[PDB]
Amino acid sequence: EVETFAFQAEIAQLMSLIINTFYSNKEIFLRELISNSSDALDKIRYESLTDPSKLDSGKELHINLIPNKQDRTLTIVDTGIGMTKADLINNLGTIAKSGTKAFMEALQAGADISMIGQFGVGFYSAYLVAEKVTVITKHNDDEQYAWESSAGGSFTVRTDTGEPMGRGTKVILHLKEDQTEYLEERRIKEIVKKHSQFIGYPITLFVE
Amino acid sequence: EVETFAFQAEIAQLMSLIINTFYSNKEIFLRELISNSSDALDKIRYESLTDPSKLDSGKELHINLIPNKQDRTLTIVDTGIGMTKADLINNLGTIAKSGTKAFMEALQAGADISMIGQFGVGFYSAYLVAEKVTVITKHNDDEQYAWESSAGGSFTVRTDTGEPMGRGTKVILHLKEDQTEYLEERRIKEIVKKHSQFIGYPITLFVE
């Protein structure tokens, strides 16, 4: 069964700004999603120190970047803490409301889209490059879920029956037709080297 | 009763580097401690979304900066999640080991002390300016504790009987005699404005 939800007005407004504003420095989306993965990995690693069985769903803590020219997707996979259904439907949205409002205020005052990550809503920078984002995620206390949104003010969530991921989050960027440079090996390597050089987890860029 | 502990060799080595290296841009300590406070506040705010009673120990989420010329202290207080005794003695040290090692590697390779926060050990930048750091902290699942260290390879922890804080962390910087500019109103305001302008919690700078 697929459930369809309305984003809060403020988050929809943010997504439309990210989609509609002229802003050429789009490559920052990748830094933001890797940053999110690094935070999710810190969180599982911290929780494991007190409950080692939290890693029974997989010990390795890493980030993979997987381009696929045939599907026109760039996937960012981590083995971090994952997201529950409540995170997907409620918690992230309530955190995203006040971050959005601060970000909007900063932007009126001359801040730049590249600062989005300071307001805790850097995930939505995926819409610089993706016409659709699919997120597959699995938290230890919950089932594997697929969330998806092409913006336009709604998102879906369903229980995912695809390949079991163990634990973590996969963000699948369905790239806009003019953004396929982000499938290119040397372009991805360039961006990781520039913005993500000191991330404390191995980042493997897959080759096609 | 006061318990005295040895830092791991790697953390002691880091503290000695921070104390001994010539590095004039000391003001970054403040950005790092405010960043830590903002992360602790995000964590309590996130946990409250699923268990609202986590805020019974205080609803306001804020950061106060309190200079005291008579004591020569600058205190950074937050009402974030706080730290347990296990965090103080074990968990932070195990996180700090691999961050230290990456940071040391980056520094050999030409990275700068100001990047310390990327390796999750920005707390130790307090030793740029403080000859002693005292941290009073209170987590919902645990007692109020006072941790303290003047570096030299050891730290102490005791149960704190001072004024109850409700929930959060107070970092008290016993400033080096030549670092008292950090007690000055206009100097603190300058640094917050430069480095901490978009923190998503109210930061109140107390006046003397």
Ligand SMILES: COC(=O)c1c(C)n[nH]c1-c1ccco1
């Ligand atoms: C559907 O996924 C998300 O919304 C998401 C992921 C995968 N990481 N961070 C976020 C997020 C959303 C809002 C603030 O953070």
Ligand SMILES: COC(=O)c1c(C)n[nH]c1-c1ccco1
């Ligand atoms: C005694 O306090 C600490 O060590 C501390 C505080 C107060 N914030 N972050 C830290 C920390 C230490 C190591 C990595 O992070």
